[PDB]
Design a protein around this ligand. Structure first.
Ligand SMILES: Cn1ccc(C(=O)NC[C@@H]2CCCO2)n1
Ligand SMILES: Cn1ccc(C(=O)NC[C@@H]2CCCO2)n1
Lengths: 301, 301
């Protein structure tokens, strides 16, 4: 029993983290096979970051200007290319610790683990969600760029995020491992406001199922609702619309608990309308939305 | 910026996890040098667990009855002993992945990372605190016993917890790596009620400092208090008494923010007395107490 915000064990990713220095900028790189992936803004001075022309900045850079250090050993850079907002540094040595891996682009509401790193050194691991506004609410200090987000499926690491920047509101933006930003964000120190941080409804319902499985049942009520009725309430409370796809994904949790998805929606509706009245659910005084239905099944199984 | 519940990177501990089977019971073991540490209740049938005599049960066990598997490779058990509530299985092979390590017995209010494992396989990592009632609020299913709690200091793993059991209230009890339970708990399936789960006041204040550092300041007020006045309020709200030792430990956070510890106590006093009024602090609607002053400095530095 018990339900915790749980990250994937980070060992397979720790084995991939390196330090990348270009001129005076140091950040983190991901070393898979004989390629090191890092944010292209490694080539920028903080001055450059105001209006960088990355193609023009990169012309002034040679392989030997990219210093790549794996622990206390230097890697030899034999090639470099820019793909979207990441640099790919070809090194002469395949990472011997390369895990089975994929690059995936996640959808908003999907959760992943972050391995926060500084100077190529793993410093902590926490669980994130891609927010509906394509930001993440991370914990990143200067030097953390190039830290990565990932899921693990048995022995296969799916990398989904590389950290690039902090918005003035202190939320985080980054890319997939093809270097495409999540959302509208750019690797430029400019006005970039995030949109509405809506609640990931399907995740909240997953977590209410987790609560029932773990003995927290006070919020279960005598009501049901419909998707359309529930969605009127969701809209009013800046919750994501619930779709039949979401209902289908919650089917196994519905089955396990014997609570129909629409009955749980009606519980969630009353919680939105009435609040918690000073009560808690799985040790939270707010409705948690950074567990996916898959996360709840995983943790509960 | 941003403040997350962060675990230590788990790689160094993943390298130590093994499967231990005795008869029909499988749980996890910790392999350091040529010793495998595991809960002694590995030798119990679920029937045994009602009133086990461990010395008598252990007489019926030989080295060859302890099956120790590290990945898909069997370790040869050449000795076994019971130390308090753990078994030490001597194997013929030193764990080649043994990190620098210590065994530490933590105090209530101290935080640590748990690597939840099943069949010797790391399944997730989360951050815990030793509660003032010597329980932890974990996430452990059947098969998770022998999962461990740890802190990391650069390259040295301090192991502080091994998981042994779940109380009927769904909170968790375990030992240090010398096999001494935290608190009054025993490895017997009997009536074991936890005492008052009081709030770790010094941790709450640490986290309020973290909030200020990260731009969440709405709860700062015009008041101060004294340790004695604050402690009258703490007692009323089932908070741990704050000592001058706690004030001294918060000194660096006080210095960094320029908020006197007793001023932050007066903020905390108003939050206890007034509640959050539907507001949040670092994304929480309750006062978080599973960050130590050391955790806040670490994450903020
Ligand atoms: C997102 N994430 C990573 C790990 C977990 C998790 O819940 N692990 C525990 C489960 C219990 C049984 C096997 O692993 N969730
Ligand atoms: C308990 N714990 C484990 C890890 C952390 C943590 O906050 N790591 C991030 C820091 C930022 C700078 C270097 O590591 N806390």
């Amino acid at each position: 029993s018990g339900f915790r915000k749980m990250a994937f064990p980070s060992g397979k990713v720790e084995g991939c983290m390196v330090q990348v220095t270009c001129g005076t900028t140091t950040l983190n790189g991901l070393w898979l096979d004989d390629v090191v992936y890092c944010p292209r803004h490694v080539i920028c001075t903080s001055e450059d970051m105001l209006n960088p022309n990355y193609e023009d900045l990169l012309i002034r850079k040679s392989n030997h200007n990219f210093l790549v250090q794996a622990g206390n050993v230097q890697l030899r850079v034999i090639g470099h290319s820019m793909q979207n907002c990441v640099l790919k540094l070809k090194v002469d040595t395949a990472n011997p610790k390369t895990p089975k891996y994929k690059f995936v682009r996640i959808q908003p509401g999907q959760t992943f683990s972050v391995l926060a790193c500084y100077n190529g050194s793993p410093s902590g691991v926490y669980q994130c969600a891609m927010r509906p506004n394509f930001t993440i609410k991370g914990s990143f200090l200067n030097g953390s760029c190039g830290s990565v987000g990932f899921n693990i499926d048995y022995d296969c690491v799916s990398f989904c995020y590389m950290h690039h920047m902090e918005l003035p509101t202190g939320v985080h933006a980054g890319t997939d491992l093809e270097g495409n930003f999540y959302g509208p964000f750019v690797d430029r120190q400019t006005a970039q406001a995030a949109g509405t941080d809506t609640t990931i409804t399907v995740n909240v319902l997953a977590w209410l199922y987790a609560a029932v499985i773990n003995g927290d049942r006070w919020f279960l009520n005598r009501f049901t609702t419909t998707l359309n009725d529930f969605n009127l309430v969701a809209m009013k409370y800046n919750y994501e619309p619930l779709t039949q796809d979401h209902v289908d994904i919650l089917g196994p949790l519905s089955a396990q608990t014997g609570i129909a998805v629409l009955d749980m929606c009606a519980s969630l509706k009353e919680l939105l309308q009435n609040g918690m009245n000073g009560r808690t659910i799985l040790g939270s005084a707010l409705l948690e939305d950074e567990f996916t239905p898959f996360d709840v099944v995983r943790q509960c199984s």
